[PDB]
Amino acid sequence: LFDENYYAKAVANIIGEVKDPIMYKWFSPDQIEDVDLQMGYQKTVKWDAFLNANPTTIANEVNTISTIGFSSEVVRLNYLKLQYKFRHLKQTSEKFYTSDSYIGDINNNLLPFAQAYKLASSEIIKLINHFVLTGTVSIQKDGKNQKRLLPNMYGLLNMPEQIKEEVASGDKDKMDKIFEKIEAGLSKLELGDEFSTPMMVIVDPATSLKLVKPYACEKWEDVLIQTIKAINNREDVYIETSNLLKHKILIYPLNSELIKFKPSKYMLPTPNEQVDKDSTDVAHSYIDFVLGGLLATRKTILQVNIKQS
Amino acid sequence: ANPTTIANEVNTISTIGFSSEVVRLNYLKLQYKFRHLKQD
Amino acid sequence: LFDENYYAKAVANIIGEVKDPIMYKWFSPDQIEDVDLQMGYQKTVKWDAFLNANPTTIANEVNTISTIGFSSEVVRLNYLKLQYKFRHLKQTSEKFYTSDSYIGDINNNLLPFAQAYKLASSEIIKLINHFVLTGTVSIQKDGKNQKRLLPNMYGLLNMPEQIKEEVASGDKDKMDKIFEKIEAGLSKLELGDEFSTPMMVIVDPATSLKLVKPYAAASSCEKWEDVLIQTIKAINNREDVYIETSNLLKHKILIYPLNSELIKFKPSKYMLPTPNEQVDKDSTDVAHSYIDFVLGGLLATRKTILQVNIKQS
Amino acid sequence: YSKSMIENKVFSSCFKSKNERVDAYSFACSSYTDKIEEYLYDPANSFPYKRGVKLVPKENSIYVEVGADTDMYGICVDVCEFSCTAYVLPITNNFEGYLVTRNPSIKIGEILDINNNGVIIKAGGGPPTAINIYALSDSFTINSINLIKVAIFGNRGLEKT
Amino acid sequence: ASLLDSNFVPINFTEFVQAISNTYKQRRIQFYENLKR
């Protein structure tokens, strides 16, 4: 194949220069499990068992023994396929644009296929990270012109049936009120018997700036970490800052029994076999990716929104 | 038409046409009759 | 590749049946040098030296010696890539249009790819020769609707800063007046230190016909051609003079030396027609192919070309 | 002016809103089977990049010059300044991309018209519009030139007001 | 690396184009060798 497909050869040679997604830092290694599906829906069945009555004492002769029952639950997850197109120079034409220490037309903004693919893959990975964190797809700073998505396709921030807290615009600068709301959300959190697990908190830069303020020689961050350690059996508590969030705080455990990411094994950018060609030196190529696959149990994510108006 | 300058992206290009001519040559048969003496 | 590209195989098989361009006869073998470029610009630097003072006599002990300076000039040339498209018959469809005497659809003007490519290449070679000789690209006998070209792209007929002479309309048949103008131009020529070189003159068919008349009372054993040759030898240090007839010219006489140090041709290595890899295909029996060619790359020193135009109007 | 427009002492400083560049790729959504043509343009009269152009057959070649919607041949999507060649998408083809406008305050969904300078303006100026142009985004200023995302799909049956 | 040599077998279109250019150059050289003004 590499003897015929120069583009496949170049993709294989330069695939290693694309940096890893930053979304991996928000999940434990056991929480992610790839699936085999490009577009469609997949039904996941979770089994459980329960005790019908007290156990039976084995003594002398007896035939009536207590029983153990079983239950099942079905969850449907939707996956979406998306594509992008980019222009690039042609392999037989690169030699006429190989300049000193660089290749490509500075005037025409044309790049070799390898560099163009690397840049496009980086941008698509950034978009995928934004979707995973937020659950919405947009290319504007205002977050408008959102692409409408299918149901059962949720992110961490917009997952339903979770704990949602709101801080009023009049209290947007009162860290005491913010922490009171955080404590209320943590109290409403329900982890059951899986409480012994590390916890992850994601905050916006403004909240990060507010956190390092003195507590009202102790810090608000320290108080928050102690409060979370009170509920998570004093396991590890990780704090992360993301520019993709705005006046939002996300708190959730890193336990694979509560929140699981089952992405498609084609989620990350993948080249397409089709390449547009003509008589000129400009060609077009396509990159595919897949979105969707976050599953969470009810009432296991705390989402605090600080209203600005 | 004039040739097309290949720069950036373009798919509308001047063409070169062809024509076929059929050459035909006509041959005609003609006859005369003349009188003479049988074998003044 | 030939096991996969029938078009490439046919082009390789039939490329040898295309005749050489006629522009090769207007330059010496040393005057032409290929360059590796398709579209863009290329710079050429020429170095010169000069003496600053009289030489220093070496005797006993001397520390101060006369110096020799240097100077340079830069010349920029432009090249342009052009393409043509032509329709033909699909390779697998030739058997259904084969005839007892030929192959192709006469009623629809469809040819095999080999013949179509040969004809298109011949036409493009003619166009390239016309551009090289005249410096303009057009498909009309009127010479209008010219394709706009890049700067620093000139031909032998439109090269700036040369010697231009104009024979008036009333003297369009006076060979004596034509020779007067030619002598004036030859006197105005400035070959510098490279004058001892062969010369080349290109004339239209009408002027060539006029040049074979006896020299004028008419004189015997000498022709106007011989008089012109002697006149050119008077300035080229009695070197060779060549005369050529080109139907592309019209009432024009072009005189220039065949010396690489004065006039050079640095064409792109892809200047002559070259097939393109892309071939349009569909469910029908008609396919399309593309041919590329590069124009540009004539360099000449100033005041070394004589162009005499005989006016008709 | 030009598209590329220069040595810098320092480099210029998320993925969102990085397309707001004068030399950005004009087609927001491209498609094979889109017809693109090449023409010459006047190098001293008007710069046709990202403007509506008209065909002017001159005595030496057919040029493209910035024109109004009444006599519009297409949209100039790219220019090669080295050869002074303009690339035109004919009006018979759809377009969805960024074009030059003169009004710095245009909202989304508004009806638009191309003026004599090949510039997007509000359709309420008074001239009867003959093309279907709609604003897909608010106009943004690059510091100064104003651009806007528009969708152009064919001619309008009856001229509006 | 020329089309004149029947032993030459091109591998790809770039080599084919280079062979065409070399063939053109060789034909020009041969013409100048055989030319007699």
SS3 annotation, chain A: CCCCCHHHHHHHHHHHHCCCCHHHHHCCHHHECCECCCCEEEEEEEEEEEECCCCCCCCCCCCCCCCEEEEEEEEEEEEEEEEEEEEEECHHHHHHCECCCCECECCCCECCHHHHHHHHHHHHHHHHHHHHHHCCCCCCCCCCCCCCCCCCCCCCCCCCCCEEEEECHHHCCCHHHHHHHHHHHHHHCCCHHHCCCCEEEEECHHHHHHHCCECCCCEHHHHHHHHHHHHCCCCCEEEEECCCCCCEEEEEECCCCCEEECCECCCCCEEEEEEECCCCCEEEEEEEEEECCEEECCCCCEEEEECCC
Task: Say how many residues make up chain E.
Answer: 37
Phi, psi for residue A209 in degrees, rounded to 5 = -65, -40
Phi, psi for residue E15 in degrees, rounded to 5 = -65, -35
Chain D residue at shortest CA distance from C138: D60
Residues A277, C278: C-beta atoms closer than 8 Å: yes
CA distance A95 to chain C (A): 10
Chain D residue at shortest CA distance from A86: D30
- In angstroms, rounded to a whole number, what is the distance separating the alpha carbons of residues C291 and C6? 16
Residues C122-158: b if buried by 16+ CB within 10 A, e if exposed: ebbbebbbbbbbbbebbeeeeeebebbbbebbbbbbe
Long-range CB pairs of A37-40, under 8 A, 24+ apart, other chains included: A37/A79, A37/A264, A37/A290, A38/A79, A38/A81, A38/A264, A38/A266, A38/A290, A39/A79, A39/A80, A39/A81, A39/A290, A40/A78, A40/A79
Q: Given CB atoms, is A282 within the 8 Å cutoff of chain B?
A: yes
Cβ-contact C272, C260 below 8 angstroms: no
| From E9, E20, E28, residue closest to C24, measured CB to CB | E28
Structure-token pair, residue B19: 């024509």
Structure-token pair, residue C151: 């700067």
DSSP character string of chain C: -TTT-HHHHHHHHHGGGSPPPGGGGGS-GGGB--B--SSEEEEEEEEEEEE-SPPPP--S-------EEEEEEEEEEEEEEEEEEEEEE-GGGSTTTB-SS-BSBTTTTB--HHHHHHHHHHHHHHHHHHHHHHS---SSTT--SPPP--TT---SSS-SSSEEEEE-GGGTT-HHHHHHHHHHHHHH---TT--SS-EEEEE-HHHHHHTTSBP----SS-BHHHHHHHHHHTTTTS--EEEEE-TT-SSEEEEEE--TTTEEE--BTT-S-EE-S--B--SSSEEEEEEEEEE--EEE-TT--EEEEE---
Local structure of residue D117 (DSSP, 8 states): T
- In angstroms, rounded to a whole number, what is the distance separating the alpha carbons of residues D147 and D128? 23
CA distance B27 to chain A (A): 50
Structure-token pair, residue A200: 């992850």
DSSP helix/strand/coil, E29: helix
Chain D residue at shortest CA distance from A283: D32
Residues 6+ positions from B1 with CB-CB distance below 8 Å? B14, B15, C139
DSSP helix/strand/coil, E33: helix
Residue A296 pairs in a beta bridge with: A259
Cα–chain center distance at C281: 37
- How many other β-carbons are positioned within 10 Å of the β-carbon of residue A25? 12
- In angstroms, rounded to a whole number, what is the distance separating the alpha carbons of residues A126 and A124? 5
Structure-token pair, residue A298: 């009810």
Residues B7, D35: C-beta atoms closer than 8 Å: no
Best C42, C148, C152 residue to mutate vs chain D (most D CBs within 10 Å): C148
Residues A279, B8: C-beta atoms closer than 8 Å: no
Q: How many CB pairs under 8 A join C and D?
A: 15
- In angstroms, rounded to a whole number, what is the distance separating the alpha carbons of residues C143 and C151? 20
Structure-token pair, residue A43: 């039904």
CA distance A286 to chain B (A): 17
Best D60, D62, D64 residue to mutate vs chain C (most C CBs within 10 Å): D60
- In angstroms, rounded to a whole number, what is the distance separating the alpha carbons of residues A289 and A21? 14
Structure-token pair, residue A57: 């004492």
DSSP helix/strand/coil, D21: coil
Residues 6+ positions from A95 with CB-CB distance below 8 Å? none
Q: Given CB atoms, is B11 within the 8 Å cutoff of chain A?
A: yes
Phi, psi for residue A127 in degrees, rounded to 5 = -65, -40
Residue A53 pairs in a beta bridge with: none
Phi, psi for residue C279 in degrees, rounded to 5 = -130, 120
Instruction: Using CB atoms within 10 Å of the CB of residue A19, give its burial: 0 to 12 exposed, 13 to 18 middle, 19+ buried.
Output: exposed
Structure-token pair, residue A264: 């498609």
Q: Do the bridges between strand C163-167 and strand B15-16 make them parallel or antiparallel, or are there none, so unpaired?
A: unpaired
| From D61, D83, D87, residue closest to B9, measured CB to CB | D87
Looking at beta carbons, which residues of chain C come within 8 Å of D83?
80, 150
Helix (H) or strand (E) run with residue D135 in it: strand D131-135
Chain D residue at shortest CA distance from C140: D60
Local structure of residue D92 (DSSP, 8 states): T
Residues 6+ positions from C105 with CB-CB distance below 8 Å? C89, C97
Q: Given CB atoms, is C119 within the 8 Å cutoff of chain B?
A: yes
Q: Given CB atoms, is C270 within the 8 Å cutoff of chain E?
A: yes
Q: Given CB atoms, is B3 within the 8 Å cutoff of chain A?
A: no
Task: Say how many residues make up chain B.
Answer: 40
Q: Do the bridges between strand C298-300 and strand C263-265 make them parallel or antiparallel, or are there none, so unpaired?
A: antiparallel
CA distance C37 to chain E (A): 12
Nearest to residue A106, comparing CAs of C294, D6, C37, C76? D6
CA distance C1 to chain B (A): 26
Residues E35, C25: C-beta atoms closer than 8 Å: yes
Residues 6+ positions from D17 with CB-CB distance below 8 Å? A139, A140, A141
Chain B residue at shortest CA distance from D82: B7
Residues C82, B6: C-beta atoms closer than 8 Å: yes
Residues 6+ positions from C113 with CB-CB distance below 8 Å? C7, C10, C88, C89, C91, C287, C289
Report how far apart, in Å, the C-alpha atoms of A120 and of each of A268, A277, A282 are: 12, 19, 17
CA distance C1 to chain E (A): 5
Cβ-contact D83, D114 below 8 angstroms: no
CA distance A283 to chain B (A): 9
- How many other β-carbons are positioned within 10 Å of the β-carbon of residue D79? 20
Residues D84, C148: C-beta atoms closer than 8 Å: yes
- How many other β-carbons are positioned within 10 Å of the β-carbon of residue C72? 8
What resolution in Å is listed for this PDB structure? 3.3
Nearest to residue E20, comparing CAs of D150, A305, C14, B21? C14
Local structure of residue D154 (DSSP, 8 states): E
Instruction: Using CB atoms within 10 Å of the CB of residue A112, give its burial: 0 to 12 exposed, 13 to 18 middle, 19+ buried.
Output: buried
Residues A263-291: b if buried by 16+ CB within 10 A, e if exposed: bbebbbbbbeeebeebbbbbbbbbbbbbb
Looking at beta carbons, which residues of chain A come within 8 Å of B13?
279
- The crossing angle, in degrees rounded to 10, of helices C175-188 and C224-233 is 10
The position carrying tokens 């010396």 is C259
Residue C88 pairs in a beta bridge with: C287
DSSP helix/strand/coil, E30: helix
CA distance C37 to chain A (A): 7
Structure-token pair, residue D91: 């009006």
Q: Which amino acid type is present at position C29?
A: P
Chain C residue at shortest CA distance from D62: C145
Residues 6+ positions from E13 with CB-CB distance below 8 Å? A92, C1, C5, C8, C277
Residues C109, B13: C-beta atoms closer than 8 Å: no
Report how far apart, in Å, the C-alpha atoms of A19 and of each of A8, A113, A132, A189 are: 19, 18, 17, 35
| From C1, C32, C269, residue closest to E21, measured CB to CB | C269
Q: Which amino acid type is present at position A146?
A: Q
Scanning C70-99 for CB atoms below 8 A from A yields 83, 85
Are C and A neighbours with ≥3 CB pairs closer than 8 A? yes
Chain B residue at shortest CA distance from C115: B18
Instruction: Using CB atoms within 10 Å of the CB of residue C291, give its burial: 0 to 12 exposed, 13 to 18 middle, 19+ buried.
Output: buried
- In angstroms, rounded to a whole number, what is the distance separating the alpha carbons of residues C268 and E24? 12
Chain D residue at shortest CA distance from B1: D61
Looking at beta carbons, which residues of chain B come within 8 Å of C86?
15-18
Report how far apart, in Å, the C-alpha atoms of A132 and of each of A125, A135, A198, A295 are: 10, 6, 20, 12
Residues 6+ positions from C231 with CB-CB distance below 8 Å? C179, C182, C183, C186
Looking at beta carbons, which residues of chain C come within 8 Å of B24?
none
Are B and E neighbours with ≥3 CB pairs closer than 8 A? no
Residues C254-275: b if buried by 16+ CB within 10 A, e if exposed: bbbbbbbebbbbbbbbbbbbbb
- In angstroms, rounded to a whole number, what is the distance separating the alpha carbons of residues A93 and A277? 12
Nearest to residue A70, comparing CAs of A52, A84, A57? A52
Task: Say how many residues make up chain D.
Answer: 161
H-helix segments, D16-90: none
CA distance C144 to chain D (A): 6
- In angstroms, rounded to a whole number, what is the distance separating the alpha carbons of residues A49 and A52? 10
Q: Given CB atoms, is A144 within the 8 Å cutoff of chain C?
A: no
Chain A residue at shortest CA distance from D33: A276
**Which chains form contacts with chain B, at 3 or more CB pairs under 8 Å?**
A, C, D
The position carrying tokens 């001047």 is B14
Q: Given CB atoms, is A281 within the 8 Å cutoff of chain B?
A: yes
- The crossing angle, in degrees rounded to 10, of helices C6-14 and E13-34 is 0
